[PDB]
RNA sequence: GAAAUUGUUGAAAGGGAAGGGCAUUUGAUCAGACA
RNA sequence: GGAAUACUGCCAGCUGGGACUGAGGACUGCGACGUAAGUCAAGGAUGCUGGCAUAAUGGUUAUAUGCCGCCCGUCUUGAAA
RNA sequence: AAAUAUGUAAGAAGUCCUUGUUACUUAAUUGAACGUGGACAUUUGAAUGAAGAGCUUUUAGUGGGCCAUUUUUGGUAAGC
């Protein structure tokens, strides 16, 4: 049994070739976001310049956080909060948007806050609080070998592909999101910014759809 | 001394501790309750197709 | 004292609709039921024989037996922490085919055709029903359509 | 409610096969943000036309900055509001540098003088009064007089220290 | 606080080990725990679990019940395995050759197998001959045959036997089991 | 045994995401955008400043 | 020759009860650990 | 007609001060940086300096001070009653 | 004639062809019910979820309750 410099070189040489693949993919995914984001800003000016008005494609993604604690919930919202994995306070997870899922959120308005997340917000959540599910076992996402082993089947072989799959809402969303254990956020480091949490955002509260302001809220709780 | 007579408070809570379960569908139901005249024939019908396959696979 | 008869509380339930009294129409009798078919129960008030109990009004089961003028439906009824499995012997006025199952059967022929045509076409299918997705972008023109400005109105009584 | 801004909103039902290209309705809202401004629009379209956010769509939501931020004007604000008993109409008279500031005083004033909340008020029309002598009220008209001067008697001095050694004077 | 969906600190409800304090039984368990880890084929998992079962869940397998398993198509030469006792039968006048592997044999069953030119094997010799468990056929005795389960589920219209010492008429055959005495069940 | 954070700790950043090496070199995070001078139509400005 | 209860000696506190919990000041007292 | 600055957002931009924590125990891994030998902030603390070696730190006990503290057992929808 | 509450369906135990079994059914091997053989596979036919799914045995305590938002009958009302 030689081993020391026979089996070892091959696997080093093999794992050297994965980074090559991981580099060009991230370089490609980098130019995808910015050129997509430039055109969304361009199209607005062309319509203004002509006469018309541009209306954006609606969001296919929302980030939801449980605001209320455990006690005194009726049995219909309480069941839904378990089907969206929100079984403790300040826990939160991503949701793909359809009509099936909007009509869920309407049932739980008073106990959660949500809205439309950005790139940066996802990037920071998935980096700082990125955990995965393996035989239940909540395992931290500190390396790529952990993600290839579990999510190689569906494509996806590096942590940024996980973010890409979440943000664009690709084919294998259901598989990639369910991988992520629901995010355990802290309380917000700047406070909630209101005296009383439990009214709708529109009446100087916290709960319900606040649209694009969720980023500021999540960035403190994370 | 009078009682409290009736209520259904807490009865729906008690019910869901152990499910509210369905009664398991089965391939082939019982011919209990089925028209006798039909069963009488169906007995004789399978005896023939078993004997037909028994004589075929001999 | 109390009164819990076999047809108590059925004043408006077994009633006969407005301008639709009298004889039942022949297409009721000319419809052919088989073992397996899904059927909705709705008790005609004119025909007193073969009637269901007020509970099974609006329930939907499967057929299991067919005899001279009746069908065996089999319903699930809930009692406590449980469902029991209950066997009815209804006359055919008080019954009719579930159109939700007939909707399904036609989609099975559609999907089998899509798969048959997809192999001849060349790969890919995607035959699941997707729910209502969020809608795409568009450029709404102002060409012959300028925005109309509105404001809130003041209070007038008119009484 | 908050430090206000002014927004423009436009919306037009949803499109259909039988009737493509609907009509475009527009309004001018006062709010702290866009999310409250979109809501107010759908509140005021429901009070007039047969529409709701399920049947409708927003087309363009645009901020309207002030035209001359540092010039003094005399606004004339109409307003409809609910008391405890009925629901009345009014004409207050405000003097400020911007429209958004006049709306910020009007809400603060109706709360003091009438106990009218944000919920109970509709700003019908804020209109700048161009010419002088188109001012019915008296408390704006006092300030419109020529060569206007007035002192500030009784000046006070907020201290840092708890004790003081001199004994203060209220001169100016 | 968490909104717990399931019960917390729930045990699995399976025996991890034999309830017995038998010395030689634990050495068989110490063997088959090693094989079940470091091999692969599921034969060793099944035999391991069977070693934990109680008396009532290891019924006796008759020597005829072994013969009827060998009349099967293809299964002439497969080393039959039984985790329990093996019992003799006097209702068969012929019996094949074969090799049986078990915990226990009766004096009559060992005699009947060797008289037909066979071989009785212990479960540790089975592991040496067949380590991954090959050319094997596992058998299990009839659990519901036991008299205790006659009585389980006793109610009306169930057909289940009452718990009763003395029998004969005038021992539960009147008001309850006939029309002539009130009603039937 | 001890979860180290990317974002801060530049090594455990570079363990993941090798592009972070070149992202910094070419700046990118502050990309200079090209500048065309398109003008809004006559209708848009009129509809904005209106009653 | 235990306890309730009592006497003498020594220490302590004590403005309409006494006793307890968390933390330290102060007073009495204590082994270990240092090779 | 040409500029500036807020307001909102982004940076895998730069950098100063403060607080709490240091689990683990030959080796194994992922990586950086180097032309090579090697080096590293990379699967959890090392280096340097002083004072003391006894009631100095620590423990127990009595008192003092801050805030807290109703009488146990019982039957009851409900007990300090 | 609403709102809220409520029954059923969204496939392998399935779909299509091939021509067997019968004392039942038809003027008629036509139908009916279960079949042999062949064709159709992991986009196998809405979402979300799933500290596994199912089954058995056996035995304790309990069978005075009370409160709150909304609906409510008795009563002038009530800590009724
Ligand atoms: K004493
Ligand atoms: Mg603070
Ligand atoms: Mg507060
Ligand atoms: Mg009672
Ligand atoms: Mg009574
Ligand atoms: Mg009659
Ligand atoms: Mg003595
Ligand atoms: Mg106190
Ligand atoms: Mg009492
Ligand atoms: Mg007490
Ligand atoms: Mg009783
Ligand atoms: Mg009472």
Question: Would you write up a description of this structure?
Answer:
The structure is cut from a larger assembly and holds chains A (222 residues), B (58 residues), C (159 residues), D (172 residues), E (185 residues) and F (51 residues). Chain A has eight helices and eight strands; from the N terminus they run H-E-E-H-E-H-E-H-E-E-H-H-H-E-E-H. Chain A has helices spanning 7-50, 77-83, 102-107, 119-128, 145-151, 159-168, 173-179, 214-221, and strands at 53-55, 61-66, 91-96, 112-115, 131-133, 138-140, 183-184, 208-209. In chain A, strands 7-3-2-4-8 form a five-stranded mixed β-sheet. A two-stranded antiparallel ribbon of chain A has the order 5-6. In chain A, a hairpin with a 4-residue loop joins strand 5 and strand 6 (138-140). Helices cover 14% and strands 24% of the residues of chain C. Chain D is built from two helices and six strands. In chain D, strands 2-1-3 form a three-stranded antiparallel β-sheet, covered by helices on one side. In chain D, strands 5-4-6 form a three-stranded antiparallel β-sheet, with helices on one face. Chain D is elongated and about 85 Å long. With 51 residues, chain F is mostly helical. The longest helix of chain F has 7 residues, at 42-48. Chain F has helices at residues 10-15, 20-25, 42-48. Chains A and F meet through helix 1 and helix 4 of A and loops of F. Strand 1 (53-55) of chain A pairs antiparallel with strand 6 of chain C. Chain C binds three RNA strands through residues 34-35, 38, 40-41, 56, 58-61, 75-76, 98, 100-101, 103-104, 107-109, 111-112, 114-116, 124-131. The PDB classes it as ribosome. Keywords: Ribosome Biogenesis, 60S, Nmd3, Lsg1, Tif6, cryo-em, Ribosome. Nmd3 is a structural mimic of eIF5A, and activates the cpGTPase Lsg1 during 60S ribosome biogenesis: 60S-Nmd3-Tif6-Lsg1 Complex. Chain A is 60S ribosomal protein L7-A.
């Amino acid at each position: 049994a030689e081993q020391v410099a026979a089996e070892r070189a091959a696997r080093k040489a093999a794992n050297k070739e994965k980074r090559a693949i991981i580099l060009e993919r991230n370089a490609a995914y980098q130019k995808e976001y910015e050129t997509a984001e430039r055109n969304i800003i361009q199209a607005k000016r062309d319509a203004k310049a002509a006469g018309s008005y541009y209306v954006e494609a609606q969001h296919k993604l929302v980030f939801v956080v449980r605001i209320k604690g455990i006690n005194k919930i009726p049995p219909k919202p309480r069941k839904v909060l378990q089907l969206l994995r929100l079984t403790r306070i300040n826990s939160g997870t991503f949701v793909k948007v359809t009509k099936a899922t909007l009509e869920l959120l309407k049932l739980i308005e008073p106990y959660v806050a949500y809205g439309y997340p950005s790139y940066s917000t996802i990037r920071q959540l998935v980096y700082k609080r990125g955990f995965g599910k393996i035989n239940k076992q909540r395992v931290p996402l500190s390396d790529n070998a952990i993600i290839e082993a579990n999510l190689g089947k569906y494509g996806i072989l590096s942590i940024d592909d996980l973010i890409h799959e979440i943000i664009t809402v690709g084919p294998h969303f259901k598989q990639a999101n369910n991988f992520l254990w629901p995010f355990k956020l802290s309380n917000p480091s700047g406070g909630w910014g209101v005296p009383r949490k439990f009214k709708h955002f529109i009446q100087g509260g916290s709960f319900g759809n606040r649209e694009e302001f969720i980023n500021k809220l999540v960035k403190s709780m994370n | 001394a009078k009682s409290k007579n009736h209520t259904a408070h807490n009865q729906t809570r008690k019910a869901h501790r152990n499910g509210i379960k369905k009664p398991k569908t089965y391939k082939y139901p019982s011919l209990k309750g089925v028209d006798p005249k039909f069963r009488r024939n169906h007995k004789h019908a399978l005896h023939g197709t078993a004997k037909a396959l028994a004589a075929a696979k001999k | 004292g109390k009164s819990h008869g076999y047809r108590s509380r059925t004043r408006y339930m077994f009633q006969r609709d407005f301008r639709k009294h009298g004889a039942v129409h022949l297409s009721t009798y000319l419809k052919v039921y088989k073992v397996g078919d899904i059927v909705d129960i709705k008790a005609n008030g004119s025909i007193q024989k073969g009637m269901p109990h007020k509970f099974y009004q609006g329930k939907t089961g499967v057929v299991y037996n067919v005899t001279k003028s009746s069908v065996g439906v089999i319903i699930n009824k809930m009692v406590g922490n449980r469902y029991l499995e209950k066997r009815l012997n209804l006359r055919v006025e008080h019954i009719k085919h579930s159109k939700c199952r007939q909707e399904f059967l036609e989609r099975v022929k559609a999907n089998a055709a899509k798969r048959a045509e997809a192999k001849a076409q060349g790969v890919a299918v995607q035959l699941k029903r997707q729910p209502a997705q969020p809608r795409e972008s568009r450029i709404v023109s102002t060409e012959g359509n300028v925005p109309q400005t509105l404001a809130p109105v003041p209070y007038e009584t008119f009484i | 409610m908050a430090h206000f801004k002014e927004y423009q909103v436009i919306g037009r039902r949803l499109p259909t096969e039988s009737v493509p290209e609907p009509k475009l309705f527009r309004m001018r809202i006062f709010a702290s943000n866009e999310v409250i401004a979109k809501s107010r629009y759908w509140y005021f379209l429901q009070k007039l036309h047969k529409v709701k956010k399920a049947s409708g769509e927003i087309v363009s939501i645009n901020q309207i900055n002030e035209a001359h931020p540092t010039k003094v004007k005399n606004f004339g604000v109409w307003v409809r509001y609910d008391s405890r008993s009925g629901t009345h109409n009014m004409y207050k008279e405000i003097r400020d540098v911007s429209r958004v500031a006049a709306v910020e005083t009007l809400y603060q004033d109706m709360a003091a003088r009438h106990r009218a909340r944000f919920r109970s008020i509709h700003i019908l029309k804020v209109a700048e009064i161009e010419k002088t002598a188109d001012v019915k009220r008296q408390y704006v008209k006092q300030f419109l007089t020529k060569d206007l001067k007035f002192p500030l008697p009784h000046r006070v001095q907020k201290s840092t220290k708890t004790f003081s050694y001199k004994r203060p004077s209220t001169f100016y | 606080g968490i909104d717990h969906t399931s019960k917390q600190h729930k045990r699995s409800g399976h025996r991890t080990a034999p309830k017995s304090d038998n010395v030689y039984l634990k050495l068989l368990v110490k063997l088959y725990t090693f094989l079940a880890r470091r091999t692969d084929a599921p034969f060793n998992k099944v035999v391991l679990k069977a070693l934990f079962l109680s008396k009532i869940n290891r019924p006796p397998v008759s020597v005829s019940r072994i013969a009827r398993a060998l009349k099967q198509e293809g299964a002439a030469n497969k080393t039959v395995v039984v985790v329990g006792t093996v019992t003799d039968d006097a209702r068969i006048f012929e019996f094949p050759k074969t090799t049986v592997a078990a915990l226990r044999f009766t004096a009559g069953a060992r005699a009947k197998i060797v008289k037909a030119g066979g071989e009785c094997i212990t479960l540790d010799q089975l592991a040496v001959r067949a380590p991954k468990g090959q050319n094997t056929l596992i058998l299990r005795g009839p659990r519901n045959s036991r008299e205790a389960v006659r009585h389980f589920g006793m109610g009306p219209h169930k057909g289940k036997a009452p718990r009763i010492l003395s029998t004969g008429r005038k021992f539960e055959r009147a008001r309850g089991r006939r029309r002539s005495k009130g009603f039937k069940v | 045994v001890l979860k180290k954070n990317p974002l801060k700790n530049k090594q455990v950043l570079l363990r993941l995401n090798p592009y972070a090496k070149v992202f910094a070199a070419e700046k990118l995070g502050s990309k200079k955008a090209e500048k065309t001078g398109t003008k809004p139509a006559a209708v848009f400005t009129e509809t904005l400043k209106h009653d």
